[PDB]
Chains A and B, each alone.
Chain A
Amino acid sequence: QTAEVTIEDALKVVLRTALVHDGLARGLRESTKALTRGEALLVVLVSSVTEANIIKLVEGLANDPENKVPLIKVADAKQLGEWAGLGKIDREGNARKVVGASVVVVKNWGAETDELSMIMEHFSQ
């Protein structure tokens, strides 16, 4: 559906606070097998990934979702890797550069339980 800037930025805050709970599943085959086991309490998608066959496998399950398959779109892959803690770790004084990721699966919620609750109550409309 339509994604706002505030929802994507809040979800990136959720990813930056859910990496530190050791409850983020970052990797494409990890995302596929987290969707297979039912452990995927959220899968995050990037709409600016150049390859689209694996996206079309995901989008075949996005237009017809199951009861335990939540999905959400954001803007950039390198920004997703930044706020998943992989791509850039930019704090007030430090920097380190890795290539960012495409899909990140939230497994454990942690300190963003109410944040993810209102994000899931906002995506369902």
Chain B
Amino acid sequence: QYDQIINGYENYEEELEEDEEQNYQPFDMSAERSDFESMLDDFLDN
């Protein structure tokens, strides 16, 4: 309740680096929501 929250505060740079090493992905079109390209077509048609 305290030791879990001060390691992500006093070492927030190192935890940010660990979260960026564990959870970084490239841009994939199909791995988004399936109706994202539909709204992409709806906005550009105004």
Are any A and B Cβ atoms less than 8 Å apart in their complex?
yes
A-contact bits for B1-40, CB 8 A (1 contact / 0 none): 1011100000000000000000000000000000000000
A107 to chain B, nearest CB (A): 16
Interface hits, A1-36 → B, CB 8 Å: 16-17, 20-21
Looking at chain B's contact residues, is the secondary structure mostly helix, strand, loop, or mixed? Answer: helix
Chain B residue nearest to A113 (CB atoms) is B4
Looking at chain A's contact residues, is the secondary structure mostly helix, strand, loop, or mixed? Answer: helix
Neighbouring B residues of A111 by C-beta, 8 Å: 1, 3-4
CA distance A111 to B7 in the complex (A): 12
| Interface flag for A110 (CB, 8 Å) | yes
CA distance A16 to B2 in the complex (A): 12
CA distance A110 to B3 in the complex (A): 11
Interface hits, A75-125 → B, CB 8 Å: 110-111
Neighbouring A residues of B5 by C-beta, 8 Å: 20
Chain A residue nearest to B3 (CB atoms) is A111
Neighbouring A residues of B3 by C-beta, 8 Å: 111
A89 to chain B, nearest CB (A): 13
B16 to chain A, nearest CB (A): 18
Partner-A contacts on B (CB < 8 A):
1, 3-5
Partner-B contacts on A (CB < 8 A):
16-17, 20-21, 110-111
Q: Which 3 A-B pairs have the closest CB atoms?
A: A111-B4, A20-B1, A17-B1
- In addition to A21-B4, A111-B1, 7 A-B residue pairs with Cβ atoms within 8 Å of each other are A16-B1, A17-B1, A20-B1, A20-B5, A110-B4, A111-B3, A111-B4
